RNA sequence: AUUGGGCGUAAAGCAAGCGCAGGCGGAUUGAAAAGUCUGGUGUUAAAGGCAGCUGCUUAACAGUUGUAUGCAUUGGAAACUAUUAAUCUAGAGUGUGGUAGGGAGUUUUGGAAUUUCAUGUGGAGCGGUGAAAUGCGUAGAUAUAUGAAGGAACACCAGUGGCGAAGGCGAAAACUUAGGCCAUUACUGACGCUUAGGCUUGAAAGUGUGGGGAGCAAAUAGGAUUAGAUACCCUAGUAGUCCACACCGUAAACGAUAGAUACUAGCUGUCGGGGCGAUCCCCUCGGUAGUGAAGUUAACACAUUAAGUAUCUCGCCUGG
């Protein structure tokens, strides 16, 4: 558990959200940094790849859902942070 | 719950019953 | 036509007419099988002591 | 009235609908409930006035806006179900588009067809009378 | 049956598997075309002839003829009737026929448009056999 | 109902001592008033087992309803895998089906039917499925009369 | 096998996941009328397949007449399909609390084993299969005890048990990480299925490198039955093995069964939680063996722990 109440209540999409779009990708990707860190640490970690490419994978279905479902409400993390 | 009742018909006693008055 | 039983692990609908009685109990099978039988005898002019009447039996399988 | 387990967004409305009827026909299972859907609720209705289904309600939680729809699948009391079976036509990833001209009986005639054409469910049947084609969505008897 | 999958490849309808390949194909000279003419009858150099024991449970002496047709390939042909083909390096004809106790055997020699010795000891079937009729 | 004779099965086994060879004998019966039945009969004798399939061919005669002297909505029979469909066909191109499939037909009271046999050649599992298909036709008065709004279609 | 089949034992599920495209994509209303249907139009070559007709002695034929898809053009319906603004949350998870497990990448020690080496003893044997022999021992072998030590992995812990992308997971400990399970009256507004393409690991055997080799070990050397004993029997014995880098990519990787969605009698019990409640019995949900009715089937048999029923996609098989 790295992160599971900072960023779903310090960042409001709508009147108010506990899960939603934006704040479980923004959530997504701090644990991608964080696993990340930890195979580069630690090498021979392959649950945690697997892990990575679903999360970042259901965040692009994520996203792409999002693209005509409304106007617009995905222009906060469409990116990638790990070069 | 049910808030519109329509077509009036309910299935409870639904084991069979035959074979009437037989010679 | 065949009359039968339904106890614990079959449907009640295998025969024409449906009884979910019981017989395997020691206070049951007694008063079933006297009111099955008077049910019938008294086509045959023939003594009927379980029909309508307070007759009735307490007593274990024997 | 749910049965257990309330029904979550299937891939469609119709294929639920006929999991929920197949299994009332062989579990011994009389009232299904399925999603809230407005073709249910027509088809459903279609079917009551036809005269092979009993009792149909909408149903709601403690809020309203959700809904799902249950129904009892005319059973008689001596254990006979009015619906023997049911096949489809149209299908999700094929809607089969058949014109006024490409409407046939239902393989004798005996059985009953619904279409999708214009603006809710016609039969087959009837659809022939005002020229009107449209999507098959499934054949019952 | 899945057909999600099998759209990009189809399936396709085999419904027969034959073994008469001579009598699809025909060659002409000054230009190559293997073009499939239902040639009725096709012809041939019957470059052997010889007797090959048959299947391990049988044991017998029938016999066979190696003939070479126009496309290219190297096979058998069965004998039939008494009179056996044994023209050695002649234009044979063959016809559609199967015998299946010898490997190989697929066709049968017809005799009276390439009339070899004209088959004798069969009169009851003149379709491969070479005959002729003792009526008027 | 005639007591005919129809298939020989020659079944044969052996145990510690001895070989019981058996022979089945297969007997259809019927009608064409829709009193139809089919038996096997298993014995060792061979009078005995005709005297089996004649019993079994007198006693069950079972009745099929004649609902237009023909076919009128598709059946498929598939019991033991070996799959007999049924198409109706034109009245005048005649019963066009197998030898035991036009005589089963004939004997049932009915003929001009469209067959189909799926599956491999073998006779009482055909027959068995053939018997499947058989109870399979549909009647409309009670899907009529059961309808809350009463009519058949 | 779209029409017209299955994949467990038939031809038959990818090794296993992630897995973009992809198709599907629960329902409301405004809108297009996009697909669908409806309404409007012009077109559809003769002889001709078909069809009324004639002339053929009559059919063989010839003609007469007609039988339309298709294609271009224009407006209405709102069901389903992609759907618009909003959406409804019943899912995906996610706010939160409880939460069990051999889950795992990472890092530590402990038990001792093992055989030795310094140490002494001691008398006479060791090796072994059906029986022996090969093969070891007085110059002290068996065996011995502590000291010290190399590689090496941890008797039991091991279940109507759980955690598991598969492959699997147990001397412990912990960093970290992952998956959960139960419950949240909740939110984005259904935001997800399969997987072209891409990504990932992959039991184990073995390989080059550097090191280590404790131990056994193929191939076998020798020896025992033997007609042969090459397979099976015993000893000596190295490749191999082992630690890490790089390469390993398959298994009878299986559930002989790829999944995902939604639904469907039960029961003996039991497991994780919510638990009233010594524990309990007793359940709520997920799981764990069986069960048997529907259902399923070529039969095996499966059956709410389907080989049951329907929706969507990738892999395969058309007789050997």
């Not at chain 3, 379980?50 to 024997?62: M, T, V």
């Not at chain 4, 309203?64 to 254990?79: A, G, P, S, W």
């Not at chain 5, 697929?106 to 010795?117: A, E, K, P, W």
């Not at chain 6, 298939?7 to 001592?17: A, F, V, W, Y």
Request: glycine share 6%; proline share 4%; aromatic share 6%.
């Amino acid at each position: 558990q790295i992160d599971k109440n900072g960023i779903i209540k310090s960042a409001q999409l709508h009147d108010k959200d506990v899960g939603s779009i934006q704040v479980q990708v923004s959530l997504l990707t701090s644990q991608i940094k964080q696993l990340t860190d930890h195979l580069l640490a630690n090498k021979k970690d392959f649950i945690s790849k697997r892990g990575l490419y679903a999360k970042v994978s259901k965040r692009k279905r994520l996203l792409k859902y999002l693209k005509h479902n409304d106007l617009e409400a995905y222009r906060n993390l469409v990116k990638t942070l790990n070069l | 719950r049910t808030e519109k009742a329509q077509k009036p018909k309910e299935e409870l006693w639904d084991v069979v019953q035959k074979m009437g008055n037989f010679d | 036509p065949v009359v039968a039983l339904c106890n614990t692990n079959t449907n009640p609908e295998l025969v024409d007419f449906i009884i979910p009685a019981n017989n395997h109990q020691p206070q049951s099978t007694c008063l079933l099988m006297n009111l099955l039988a008077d049910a019938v005898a008294e086509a045959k002019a023939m003594p009927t002591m379980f029909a309508y009447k307070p007759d009735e039996e307490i007593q274990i399988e024997i | 009235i749910t049965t257990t387990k309330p029904i979550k967004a299937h891939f469609d409305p119709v294929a639920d609908l006929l999991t929920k009827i197949n299994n009332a026909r062989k579990a011994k299972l009389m009232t299904v409930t399925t999603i809230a859907s407005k073709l249910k609720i027509a088809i459903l209705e279609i079917l009551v006035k036809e005269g092979y289904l009993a009792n149909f309600q909408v149903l709601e939680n403690k809020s309203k806006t959700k809904r799902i729809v249950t129904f009892n699948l005319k059973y008689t009391q001596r254990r006979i179900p009015s619906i023997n079976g049911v096949k489809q036509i149209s299908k999700p990833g094929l809607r089969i588009y058949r014109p006024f001209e490409k409407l046939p009986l239902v393989l004798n005639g005996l059985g009953i067809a619904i279409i999708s054409t214009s603006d809710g469910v016609m039969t087959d049947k009837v659809a022939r009378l005002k020229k009107i084609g449209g999507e098959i969505l499934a054949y019952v008897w | 049956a899945t057909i999600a999958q099998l759209i990009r490849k189809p399936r396709k309808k085999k419904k027969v598997k034959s073994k008469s390949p001579a009598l699809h194909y025909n060659l002409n000279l000054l230009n190559k075309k293997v073009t499939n003419v239902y040639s009725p009858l096709k012809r041939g150099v019957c470059t052997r002839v010889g007797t090959m024991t048959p299947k391990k449970p049988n044991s017998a002496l029938r016999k066979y003829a190696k003939v070479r047709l126009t496309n290219g390939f190297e096979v058998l042909t069965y004998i039939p009737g008494e009179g056996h083909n044994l023209q050695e390096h002649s234009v044979t004809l063959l016809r559609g026929g199967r015998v299946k106790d010898l490997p190989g055997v697929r066709y049968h020699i017809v005799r009276g448009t390439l009339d070899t010795v004209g088959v004798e000891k069969r009169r009851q079937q003149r379709s491969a056999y070479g005959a002729k009729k003792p009526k008027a | 109902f005639e007591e005919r004779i129809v298939k020989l099965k020659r079944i044969s086994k052996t145990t510690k001592g001895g070989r019981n060879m058996r022979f089945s004998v297969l007997v259809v019966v019927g009608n064409r008033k829709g009193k139809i039945g089919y038996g096997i009969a298993k014995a060792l004798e061979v009078p005995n087992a005709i005297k089996k399939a004649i019993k079994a061919a007198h006693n069950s005669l079972h009745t099929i309803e004649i609902h237009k002297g023909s076919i009128y909505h598709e059946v498929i029979g598939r019991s033991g895998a070996s799959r007999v469909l049924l198409k109706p066909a034109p009245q005048g191109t005649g019963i066009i089906a197998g030898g035991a499939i036009r005589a089963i037909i004939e004997l049932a009271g009915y003929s001009d039917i469209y067959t189909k046999n799926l599956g491999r050649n073998t006779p009482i599992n055909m027959i068995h499925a053939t018997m499947d298909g058989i109870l399979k036709q549909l009647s409309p008065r009670r899907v009529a009369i059961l309808r809350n709004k009463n009519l058949n279609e």
